[PDB]
Amino acid sequence: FQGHMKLVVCSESDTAGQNIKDNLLTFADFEEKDVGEFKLYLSDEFYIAETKERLIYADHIDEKLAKYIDFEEILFASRHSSKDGRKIFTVHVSGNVGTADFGGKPYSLAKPSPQTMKNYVLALRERLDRKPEFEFTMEVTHHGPSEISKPSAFYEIGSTEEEWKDREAAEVVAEAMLDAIRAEKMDWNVAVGVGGTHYAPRQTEIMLTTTFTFGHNFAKYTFEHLTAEFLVKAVKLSEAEYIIIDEKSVNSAVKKIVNEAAEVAGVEVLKSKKVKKDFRLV
């Protein structure tokens, strides 16, 4: 059973997650309840769940929470840590290709939530100028938890403690989440992306300016470990009808498995430049 409400999940020890939570709590009349290992906040709008577990290791947490409440998807609210120290708002779906160094299992992918991710990004774009020093960017699929069956995605703030403690940054994310949760448009074109650096530049531009959204995205560092069958799993899991390639990143070797996957799954392959040109929004 999936119910019809959306669930925001955060970690008790995550500063960013907590600030996002505090802001989300003012958007509706909530009632806290402590069941099992969680702290649940209920309302007739959306749900919020607090766990003491580190999110990247929260495999099967959707099954655990589903014992107490019904929800159709999860929006993980968390901080983003990076050595670049850049101030950014990011979105990505968890999952691993060849290595599972930070949660989950190898070659396992979490169920994405392409529509909500898209609505969130457009709602964020609308407010980005409130925090001029911040920039938005997608993150390729990486890190745990990989064992999540309910549609999901991670909505984060980074890259250091300076940003995690940023009250307004968390408030902007919370507002974008509320807009995503209430959004009715659920027919954005869905694709799995292949190619690019860890911050998926092409995919980020596509998310901000076209009618396309993404489920999973695989960075160039994953090329050697990708297989045609793994890509088919990603496409079907994402409910994608397309595979978009970063034509400047993909090599002939990876293009072969991409084409293989496209044929087996019955989806169309499109170059990122063509997507940006023929699928603009306004």
Curated annotation (Swiss-Prot):
GO biological process, one term: D-amino acid catabolic process
GO function term, MF aspect, one: zinc ion binding
Keywords: Hydrolase, Metal-binding, Zinc
Pfam name, any one: tRNA_deacylase
Entry-linked Gene3D superfamilies: AF0625-like
Comment on bound cofactor: Binds 2 Zn(2+) ions per subunit.
Reaction(s) catalysed (UniProt annotation): a D-aminoacyl-tRNA + H2O = a tRNA + a D-alpha-amino acid + H(+); glycyl-tRNA(Ala) + H2O = tRNA(Ala) + glycine + H(+)
Swiss-Prot/TrEMBL cofactor(s): Zn(2+)
Keyword GTP-binding: no
EC number: 3.1.1.96
Stored InterPro entries: Deacylase_DtdA_archaea (IPR018033), DtdA (IPR007508)
Keyword Metal-binding: yes
Free-text function comment from the UniProt entry: D-aminoacyl-tRNA deacylase with broad substrate specificity. By recycling D-aminoacyl-tRNA to D-amino acids and free tRNA molecules, this enzyme counteracts the toxicity associated with the formation of D-aminoacyl-tRNA entities in vivo.
Assembly and oligomerization: Monomer.
Similarity annotation: Belongs to the DtdA deacylase family.
Name this protein carries in UniProt: D-aminoacyl-tRNA deacylase
